[PDB]
């Protein structure tokens, strides 16, 4: 356990309590600092230690630690709490500053867990002018994150570009996954997009052709 480890992602609905964990050696006997970083902004020091927190910072943020684990507890989560969170420790013996791996937290729309609807992105015009054809999959209206999307069950990793998701106004996610191949290949062989969405325990396989 050389560094500080945190769960990569935590999601919670408004009004709930979010508990973020931090792992390390002899952390309970140490002071643990928690920083918050909203998208495109600088980190801010949220919790120095336990309930000791800087000026102008909500009483809902509280710190804790026992043995090898520490915990940032966010009581009554609000939409504004949606940001990345980093635990941090200082070893005064070797004068080392260590951050955590980071925890992306999200405030849910409280929408029902929904399986994705994958529509085909068919090439016709694009194939022609380029000398290279772009075909794809439009994975629409799923919740929550994430989905994994392969092509031909992993038979090709060459031209595939899997884009990040976006949060629609419906509170659901839209995903795009494209791949580029020559027209010659486009004519003869089959192209299957394989969508695997764990949170709904479903999966779809869609055929993309001329």
């Amino acid at each position: 356990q050389p560094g500080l480890t945190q769960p990569p992602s935590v999601s919670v609905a408004p009004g709930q309590t979010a508990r973020i964990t931090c792992g390390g050696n002899n952390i309970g006997s140490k002071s643990v600092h928690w920083y918050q970083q909203k998208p495109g902004q600088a980190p801010v020091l949220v919790v120095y230690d336990d309930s000791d927190r800087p000026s102008g910072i909500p009483e809902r943020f509280s710190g804790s630690n026992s043995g090898n684990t520490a915990t940032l507890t966010i009581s009554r989560v609000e939409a504004g709490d949606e940001a990345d969170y980093y635990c941090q420790v200082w070893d005064s013996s070797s004068d080392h500053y260590v951050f955590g791996t980071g925890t992306k937290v999200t405030v849910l729309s409280s929408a029902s867990t929904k399986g994705p609807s994958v529509f085909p992105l068919a090439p016709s015009s694009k194939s022609t002018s380029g000398g290279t054809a772009a075909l794809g999959c439009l994975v629409k209206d799923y919740f929550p994150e994430p989905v994994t999307v392969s092509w031909n069950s992993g038979a090709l990793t060459s031209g595939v570009h899997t884009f990040p998701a976006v949060l629609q106004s419906s509170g659901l996610y839209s995903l795009s996954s494209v791949v580029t191949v020559p027209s010659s290949s486009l004519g003869t062989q089959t192209y299957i997009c394989n969508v695997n969405h764990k949170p709904s325990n479903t999966k779809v396989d869609k055929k993309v052709e001329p």
Binding site: Y35, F99, F119, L121, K126, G136, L138, S176
Partner: protein, 234 residues
């Protein structure tokens, strides 16, 4: 009020060296340690090191030990960080964060040694080794099944372009669109070192039938004149 102001965004090349300034205000410069900590896009925070403005002394991490030098000017109350022998994975946002000297208790009331109580706004630093390339713009009309769903989504795909900076605008009946489309970008850093962009313009079916014509316009640096890709029913 206490504030830290860093130098503007900078663009460099592999092998070169970058310098970043940090201007402190609203407090005693010599009373606090000044740290430098960076983060790569979509990565975690990584401590680079500290300088003590009062004595000028420094302490670097073992990773950056040889390449980085942190200096200071007390007169203008400014700290500096220089990174040499730059490579591509040094591409990151660089923050300067203040941390209380354990030997200097302040009248502020909040004695927080070991923590970074104040952060700068950050400085963007890019290392390329990549030529400037125009996008490959493709377009996709909505699938028939999606039309059966009642909604329609047209997709604009800008492929293998450099740099990130690009403009996308949607035209229905030669008319500019605002407040409908959403977009996303992927950085492939392996070979191309380029960014691919997916834009999705979403309308209802009714507007889709009643409007009768669709085009996607894109303006980029690497291309001479704005490229428009068009498509329609038929």
């Amino acid at each position: 009020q206490v504030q830290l102001v860093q130098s503007g965004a900078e663009v460099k090349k592999p092998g070169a060296s970058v310098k970043v300034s940090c201007k402190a205000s609203g407090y005693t410069f010599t009373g606090y340690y000044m740290h430098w900590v960076r983060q790569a896009p979509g990565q975690g925070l990584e401590w680079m090191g500290w300088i003590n403005p009062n004595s000028g002394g420094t302490n670097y991490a073992q990773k950056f030990q040889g390449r980085v030098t942190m200096t200071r000017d007390t007169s203008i109350s400014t700290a500096y960080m220089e990174l040499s022998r730059l490579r591509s994975d040094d591409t990151a946002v660089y923050y300067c964060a203040r941390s209380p000297n354990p030997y200097y208790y302040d009248s502020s009331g909040y004695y927080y040694p070991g923590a970074f109580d104040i952060w700068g706004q950050g400085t963007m630093v890019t290392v390329s080794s990549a030529s400037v390339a125009a996008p490959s713009v493709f377009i996709f009309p909505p699938s028939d099944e999606q039309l059966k769903s009642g909604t329609a989504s047209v997709v604009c795909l800008l492929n293998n372009f450099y740099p990130r900076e690009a403009k996308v605008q949607w035209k229905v009946d030669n008319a500019l669109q605002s407040g409908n489309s959403q977009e996303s970008v992927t950085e492939q850093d392996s070979k191309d070192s380029t960014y691919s962009l997916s834009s999705t313009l979403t309308l209802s079916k009714a507007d889709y039938e009643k409007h009768k014509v669709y085009a996607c316009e894109v303006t980029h640096q690497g291309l001479s004149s704005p490229v428009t890709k068009s498509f329609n029913r038929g």
